[PDB]
């Protein structure tokens, strides 16, 4: 009873090739093993040579990166085929359970394919760090070879009347499409860089921004997966432990984020709009359209990541519901009904109903969310920071203005400096919280929808309690900001008085007038202390609300469902899926008030900036 | 979340002014950059080198340059990858030829005494290292086995020749 590739039932009758060499359902799996192990045994010597070269003599310490055409879509196809290969492994482990011994022909090909995909992106990266695309022939034959072999497997399944009921048919069909859509990528590289069958290769030089000697913020010129997890930051962070961070140790920022480059882009938007449209002034709405047209191509991308991250965030409570539902019912059967040619096919419903499989899927879903959410954050921040540079340059351009008593007597240099600092910072902070207004409504809507499905009308009562904490937080935060305004505009006078009564220390000390002026300052300090007491009250209500809205909602939720409703008796699956949903919904509900305030202040800031940017100029 | 969203407002009335820099001494930080170390080891870090594959095209200069432990790894992996690759081929041709299923007395297997993948892997060891323990022959039943035998012998001799040259 040893480890056999096709099992050991019916006296090894699974190995008979009498009817057909390629009609033996275990032989097609054996064929699919070949292209993956072929890549491993042709690339491992190459990879170890590369690793040795890095160790013994890493001559190109700052080697430039040349990314081949079709490089972002290359990585995303690898990511989604890694997903399906994990699912194939899960199906194989789940189907072999109903046999006398482990079959090994359900999850050996998928396991070696999983390792082959990982090694085929490591090999591709090592052939992208140093521009040498002739070694990519090994990858083109590999992809097409795999596409051939499982195509044979796919057509055999359709002959034997498998259909879309069996999960592995769907997985194999989808995976075959993946291999075709990535073989096309490889031939795209052939077509562009013209290295294999064309007369003269069309070489490309690395972008000039990376060619600059001092550029440490090399975020754009990085492979997609190190953009997700910020792997390039590791070396920089390690260096910061030994040597400090000097202003000459920080990078010279790339061309894409230069102030003048963003200023030129913003000027292009302004000029194109003001020419194609007969709107004579460049007023508030003109600037609003200009910002959208100039930075929309990145703002939309951030929103897409945020929406995907939100939809994947709701896969934690839902998977918990599935896991704990399966975890009861005494596990009476746990058997695969479908039988085909002595092998069992786990149905789709039988797949997402298991516990270990759902837990592995939950882990993978979290890996996507935690990275999409951070990727969405970075795109929003980078667009906001580029906005700050362009807007600051634009403001300073109009400063180059007439010094009339009408203009200079209305907005003094203090006003314009405050305009620069305050308005642009809170306009930038609007572009940070900008994907929220597109996503957070979807988050709340979809959260309430699927929370109703899990529990019922009592969940809507609890959702009402939480959704009744955005207006409460809004009023408290407005009161908090008003109290802070009063306290801060009072300490300004105190600080000016203290500076005035401490600059002349010698004069006051000589006349024995040090303590008297100290008490004159302490009086204003006591007044500011009363104001700060109001500020402390209004900030303690916010701490209370933040840390007691979810708990009060939970109490109302469950008490209503048991006492008032009595519809369905509580279960651990329902009662913890709903509780987990409450945490994931409390996080954005509180911050929604700050998003609204930021949007309001953004409108007022652009009103300020448009009353300035269209003032009286100097001359022609 | 101390300042996750509440850091947007700016006072713009801060009292911050000039302060002592307390910069570290430049003499201690600055050290004479030696062109070459006391014993060779030229300390001239290169930068911005454009890579056109020149460093990986001359694989034999690279192989000799590498340290012995890395050469041992490449030595071992080259042999073991070829051994495993041809083991897969030998196992799969046997399982395709249907000779490890029947056990029938009249059928003549194309590779005698193939019973599993361990036997196929041992047969791959014997062919490429040229040991030939005799218990796993090649019969005349399928000409594909003869072609694979030719390919395996030629590949093994090429690999041995290249590794011999690098070692010398």
């Amino acid at each position: 009873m040893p480890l056999a590739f096709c099992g050991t039932e019916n006296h090894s009758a699974a190995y008979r090739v009498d009817q057909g060499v390629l009609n033996n359902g275990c032989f097609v799996d054996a064929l699919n093993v070949v292209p993956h192990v072929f890549l491993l045994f042709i690339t491992f010597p190459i990879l170890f040579i590369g690793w040795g070269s890095q160790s013994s003599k890493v001559h190109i310490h700052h080697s430039t990166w040349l990314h081949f055409p079709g490089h972002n879509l290359r990585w995303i196809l690898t990511f989604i085929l890694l997903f399906v290969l994990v699912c194939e492994i899960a199906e194989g482990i789940l189907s072999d359970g109903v046999t006398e011994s482990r079959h090994l022909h359900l999850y050996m090909p998928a396991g070696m394919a999983f390792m082959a995909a990982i090694t085929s992106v490591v090999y591709y990266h090592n052939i992208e760090t140093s521009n040498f695309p002739k070694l990519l022939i090994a990858l083109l034959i590999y992809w097409t070879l795999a596409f051939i072999t499982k195509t044979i497997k796919f057509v055999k399944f359709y002959d034997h009347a498998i259909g879309f009921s069996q999960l592995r048919f769907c997985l194999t069909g989808l995976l075959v499409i993946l291999y075709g859509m990535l073989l096309l990528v490889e031939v795209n590289v052939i077509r562009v860089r013209r290295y294999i069958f064309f007369k003269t290769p069309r070489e490309v030089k690395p972008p000039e921004d990376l060619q600059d000697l001092g550029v440490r913020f090399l975020q754009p010129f990085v492979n997609l997966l190190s953009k997700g997890t910020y792997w390039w930051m590791n070396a920089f962070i390690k260096t910061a432990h030994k040597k400090p961070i000097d202003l000459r140790a920080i990078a010279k920022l790339p061309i894409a984020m230069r102030a003048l480059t963003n200023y030129q882009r913003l000027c292009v938007a302004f000029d194109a709009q003001a020419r194609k449209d007969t709107q004579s002034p460049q007023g508030a709405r003109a600037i609003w359209r200009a910002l959208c047209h100039a930075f929309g191509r990145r703002l939309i991308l951030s929103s897409t990541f945020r929406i995907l991250a939100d939809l994947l965030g709701f896969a934690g409570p839902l998977c918990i519901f599935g896991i704990v539902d399966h975890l009861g019912k005494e596990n009476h059967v746990f058997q695969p009904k479908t039988q085909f040619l002595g092998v069992y096919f786990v149905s789709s419903q039988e797949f997402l109903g298991n516990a270990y499989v759902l837990a592995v899927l939950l882990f993978l879903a979290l890996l996507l969310q935690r990275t999409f959410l951070q990727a969405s954050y970075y795109v929003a921040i980078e667009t906001g920071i580029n906005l700050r540079g362009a807007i600051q340059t634009k403001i300073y351009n109009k400063i180059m203005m007439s010094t009339s008593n009408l203009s200079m007597g209305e907005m003094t240099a203090g006003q314009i400096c405050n305009l620069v600092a305050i308005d642009t910072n809170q306009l930038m902070w609007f572009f940070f919280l900008c994907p929220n207004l597109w996503t957070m409504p979807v988050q709340i809507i979809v959260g309430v929808i699927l929370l109703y499905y899990i529990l019922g009308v009592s969940a809507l009562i609890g959702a009402a309690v939480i959704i009744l904490l955005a207006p409460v937080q809004y009023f408290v935060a407005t009161k908090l900001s008003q109290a802070q305004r009063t306290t801060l505009e009072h300490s300004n006078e105190r600080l000016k008085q203290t500076n005035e009564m401490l600059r002349g220390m010698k004069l006051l000390k000589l006349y024995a007038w040090e303590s008297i002026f100290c008490s004159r300052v302490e009086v204003t300090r006591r007044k500011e202390m009363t104001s700060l007491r109001a500020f402390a009250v209004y900030t303690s209500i916010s701490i209370f609300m933040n840390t007691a809205i979810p708990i009060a909602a939970v109490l109302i939720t469950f008490v209503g469902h048991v006492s008032f409703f009595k519809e369905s008796d509580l279960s651990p699956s329902v009662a913890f899926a709903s509780l987990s949903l409450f945490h994931i919904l409390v996080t954005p509900l509180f911050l929604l008030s700050s998003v609204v305030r930021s949007t309001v202040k953004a409108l007022v800031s652009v009103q300020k900036l448009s009353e300035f940017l269209s003032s009286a100029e100097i001359r022609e | 979340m101390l300042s996750r969203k509440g850091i947007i407002p700016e006072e713009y009335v801060l009292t911050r002014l000039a302060e002592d820099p307390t910069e570290p001494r430049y003499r201690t930080r600055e050290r004479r950059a030696r062109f070459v170390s006391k014993k060779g080891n030229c300390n001239v870090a290169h930068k911005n080198i454009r890579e056109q594959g020149r460093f990986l095209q001359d694989v034999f200069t690279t192989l000799v340059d590498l340290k012995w432990p890395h050469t041992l790894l490449i030595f071992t992996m080259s042999f073991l990858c070829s051994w495993l690759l041809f083991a897969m081929v030998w196992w799969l041709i046997a399982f395709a030829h249907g000779d490890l299923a029947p056990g029938e007395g009249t059928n003549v297997p194309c590779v005698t005494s193939i019973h599993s993948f361990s036997s196929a892997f041992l047969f791959s060891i014997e062919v490429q290292v040229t040991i030939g323990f005799g218990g796993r022959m090649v019969t005349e039943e399928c000409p594909l086995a003869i072609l694979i035998l030719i390919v395996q012998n030629i590949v093994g001799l090429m690999i041995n020749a290249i590794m011999l040259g690098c070692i010398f």
Binding site: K242, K243, P244 | P24, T28, R29
Partner: peptide, 4 residues
């Protein structure tokens, strides 16, 4: 150094 002293900074470290």
């Amino acid at each position: 150094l002293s900074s470290v």
